[PDB]
Design a protein around this nucleic acid. Structure first.
Ligand SMILES: [Mg+2]
Ligand SMILES: [Mg+2]
Length: 821
RNA sequence: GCCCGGAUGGUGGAAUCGGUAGACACAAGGGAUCCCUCGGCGUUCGCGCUGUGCGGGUUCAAGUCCCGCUCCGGGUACCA
């Protein structure tokens, strides 16, 4: 019989074994079913799950289990972003090498994920550090090279690097943000600003005693009459020409290479092409040599950086834009930034921003000293690292100096895993023999740098669709069946790195014919951070010592606010509130400890209950114990119910009004929970609705056969509704209730419309807008019947005593407001 | 600087379409693991006044819609 006591330790590993043995969450490309691809950002194998992993993957798993119960064919994959820096650190610190360390972390973390009962298709599990994964990005990289999308260049970080031409897709990456209605605006705005398409004008100046011109780039050509000096990047040819005869500038250039406004007068004078005036050219620290032309016309009255530099160096500050209210601006403190009507600008006075922009661009073009120009903040993607633990770059240099891709017959370029790290140099660099190779029987040197680990995370989501496919990077039929990802769950912190790279890589894959869609993921859900209480004491040395909130001993006033805290050693603690988890504040909570203390189901439930998915969640032991206690109550109710044996069939027509009202609450809950999980994604309020119903069901009668049949229906519905959140307990309870088959394949409950119909309705009676009663009336009562009933309420009548009803507002079956005077 | 979120009890937060504010849970307390009570003030226990950051507006009716303000949280920029 059913155990009386709920014991996660006797239930969770058994259900988990069942899921592995039956391969419950393994899926194929079944065209007779509607697909749903639920994806969570894959973990780095650091060694132990953190609470953010737990939140992220619980959200994914709730969604994946729900969509299955709706009858979809659901892919939920997991894997390991396994290359990267931290393994080198650890290898050196320990007796070891990056690979064994990494494989150990995977085993450990994998067992943690299974202990949490995330329903992954384990047969699609990938580790990005294996040659079976990385060979394909090696081959893809050679293809990109052949398409003209990859090149070598020396650059600052200064060293040679391999670049992929992400700028060749800048406009698509920008325009397609408008297809991403189910991405958060914050993420979209971050990518927009990162790409930074800029519409401006290049303007060329003649410079005295300089046998060249100087070209600047501006987005505010409308301010050109306020240009009081030019500034050039430290690395600009003009600055380097002047430094020939200028120690000060020479010194300044050198400092900038290494490295608050700073500059050196170049001594050169440029001629403003419209005013004829001579203006000074400075070399300045705020001017990036790599963007636009490496030079700007400075307009200190209207650019804040130009303002600060001009004040510091005594340069003229000229106003040429009116304030919003039409008034000449106050530039005594700072730049007037806003676009406005021109003054102090000759023939352009009175023009607004757009008119002035175009009039001045037009003029300078006609004069042949300017032209419209679009620039982009986006730079090409440097994918080269001088680091051991990553996929080797499949390029080779022939003795004659020809750089070319590694022949297809030498892919993959295997990174050797059995190495000894000396801590300062890559083993594949330190050994001069590794780079030696042959290409067409001519000696060749193979590349020794490895890929940026963003390389692996940029396409893993697609490889999951066909992870054992050996004929290519993607099996396109499989990929096009699963893709695009339906929901991608992970942090907002990846907004302009990975979240941009994976869109870009998707498009590269489409354009290699490998997929037939434009965007990799339809919905992006960024889960909020998990916070914990933070405490510290000040030692006798004046140093703050942070004390884990587990170890804090708190005391509270009679309304429960923390008023004093100590640690065991008796130090006085300062409470800093809820903060981001961190080693430095020492407030990290170990998910493994809570799983072992309360069971996975308690942890999962708490995490989904405590806060909306996209808001920060405040971890509280209090809350977790609450969720645990709720599970015991569910267990208890089902224990009591099943003790009493089978149930007769529910007779829906013969139910009492109290029975009808409970049954209506069951089905209204089904509908609210369905809407909340599936449309609104408010998982907290879904769980709240289940708790609310469970409270009612614990108070319902359970003697009569009808009461028991009603309870059976309710419990079969509650357990299914709980299942995506707490599936171990729900799997087991489902059997105890004698539900049909495994709960993982049971259909999501659907609300019975007949069960939800009401025989009465509550009407809120107001008098001049103030609630004076709430009356229950027949569901189809007429407005005059409702009125009559409201006047019979003494609570209302006593506000109708000796006053006149001027009018009435009535919302059928909801509200009657009697307006009186 | 600009991009957001947000501001409702002692706490975390609900309120979807303007119409019973505070669901659900924690902390309380205090009763016999279950039952109840729980925004404030008063209460004849039926309710009355008051109440969603501040100030106005719209409306029979505002947490919800518009107009200011004050305060908070988190991103993010020498890209001209
Ligand atoms: Mg010249
Ligand atoms: Mg408050």
């Amino acid at each position: 019989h059913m155990q009386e006591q709920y014991r996660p330790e006797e239930i969770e590993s058994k259900v988990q074994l069942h899921w592995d043995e039956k391969r419950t969450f393994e899926v194929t490309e079944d065209e007779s079913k509607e697909k749903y691809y639920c994806l969570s950002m894959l973990p780095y194998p650091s060694g132990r799950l953190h609470m953010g992993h737990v939140r992220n993957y619980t959200i994914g798993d709730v969604i994946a289990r729900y969509q299955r119960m709706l009858g979809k064919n659901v892919l939920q994959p997991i894997g390991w972003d396994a290359f990267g820096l931290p393994a080198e650190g650890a290898a050196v610190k320990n007796n070891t090498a990056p690979a064994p360390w990494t494989y150990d972390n995977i085993a450990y973390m994998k067992n943690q994920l299974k202990m949490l009962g995330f329903g992954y298709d384990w047969s699609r599990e990938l580790a990005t550090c294996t040659p079976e994964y990385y060979r394909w990005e090696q081959k893809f990289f050679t293809e990109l090279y052949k398409k003209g999308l990859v090149y070598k260049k020396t650059s600052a970080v200064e060293i040679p690097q391999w670049f992929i031409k992400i700028t060749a897709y800048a406009d698509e990456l920008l325009n397609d943000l408008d297809k991403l209605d189910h991405w958060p605006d914050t993420v979209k705005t971050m990518q927009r600003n990162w790409i930074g398409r800029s519409e401006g004008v290049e303007i060329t100046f003649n410079v005295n005693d300089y046998d060249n011109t100087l070209t600047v780039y501006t987005t505010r050509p409308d301010t050109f009459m306020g240009c009081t000096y030019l500034a050039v990047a430290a690395g600009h040819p003009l600055a380097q020409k002047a430094a020939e005869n200028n120690p000060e500038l020479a010194a300044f250039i050198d400092e900038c290479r290494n490295t608050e406004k700073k500059g050196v007068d170049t001594g050169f004078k440029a001629v403003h092409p419209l005013t004829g005036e001579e203006i000074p050219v400075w070399a300045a620290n705020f001017v990036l040599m790599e963007y636009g032309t490496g030079a700007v016309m400075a307009v200190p009255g209207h650019d804040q950086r130009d303002y600060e530099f001009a004040s510091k160096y005594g340069l003229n500050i000229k106003p040429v834009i009116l304030a919003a209210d039409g008034s000449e601006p106050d530039l005594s403190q700072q730049a007037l930034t806003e676009k406005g009507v021109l003054f102090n600008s000759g023939e352009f006075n009175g023009l607004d921003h757009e008119a002035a922009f175009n009039a001045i661009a037009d003029k300078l073009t006609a004069m042949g000293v300017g032209e419209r120009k679009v620039n982009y903040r986006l730079r090409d993607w440097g994918v080269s690292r001088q680091r051991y633990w990553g996929a080797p770059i499949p390029m080779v240099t022939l003795e004659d100096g020809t750089v070319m891709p590694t022949p297809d017959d030498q892919l993959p370029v295997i990174l050797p895993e059995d190495v000894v790290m000396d801590g300062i140099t890559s083993p594949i660099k330190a050994d001069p023999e590794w780079a030696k190779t042959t290409v067409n029987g001519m000696p060749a040197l193979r590349e020794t740098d490895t890929f940026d680990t963003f390389m692996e995370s940029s396409w893993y989501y697609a490889r999951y669709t066909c992870p054992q496919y050996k004929e290519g990077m993607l099996d396109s039929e499989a990929a096009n069946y699963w893709l695009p990802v339906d929901i991608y769950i992970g942090g907002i912190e990846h907004a302009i790195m990975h979240l941009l790279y994976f869109r870009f890589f998707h498009k590269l894959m489409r354009d290699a014919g490998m997929v037939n869609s434009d965007e990799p993921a339809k919905q992006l859900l960024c889960q909020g951070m998990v916070l914990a209480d933070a405490f510290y004491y000040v030692g006798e040395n004046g140093e703050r010592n942070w004390v884990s909130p587990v170890d804090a001993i708190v005391e509270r006033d009679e309304k429960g606010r923390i008023v004093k805290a100590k640690d065991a050693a008796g130090h006085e603690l300062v409470y800093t509130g809820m903060s981001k988890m961190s080693k430095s504040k020492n407030n990290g909570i170990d998910p493994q400890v809570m799983v072992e203390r309360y069971g996975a189901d308690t942890v999962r439930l708490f995490m989904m209950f405590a806060s909306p998915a996209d808001m920060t969640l405040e971890w509280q032991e209090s809350g977790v114990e609450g969720a645990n206690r709720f599970l015991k109550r569910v267990w208890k109710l089902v224990y009591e119910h099943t003790a009493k044996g089978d149930v007769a069939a529910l007779n829906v027509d013969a139910l009492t009004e109290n029975q009808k009202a409970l049954r209506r609450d069951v089905h209204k809950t089904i509908a609210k929970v369905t809407d909340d999980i599936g449309r609104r994604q408010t998982f907290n309020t879904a769980i709240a609705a289940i708790m609310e119903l469970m409270n009612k069901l614990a108070k319902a009668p359970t003697d009569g056969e009808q009461d028991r049949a009603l309870m059976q229906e309710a419990l079969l519905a509650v357990v299914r509704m709980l299942n995506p959140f707490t599936p171990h307990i729900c799997f087991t309870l489902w059997q105890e209730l004698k539900g049909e088959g495994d709960i993982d394949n049971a259909p999501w409950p659907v609300a019975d419309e007949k069960a939800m119909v009401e025989d009465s309705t509550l009407v809120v009676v107001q008098v001049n807008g103030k609630v004076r009663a709430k009356i229950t009336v027949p569901v189809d009562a007429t407005e005059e019947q409702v009125r009559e009933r409201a006047g019979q309420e003494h609570l209302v009548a006593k506000y109708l005593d000796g006053v006149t009803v001027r009018k009435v507002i009535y919302v059928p079956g909801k509200l009657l407001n009697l307006v009186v005077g």
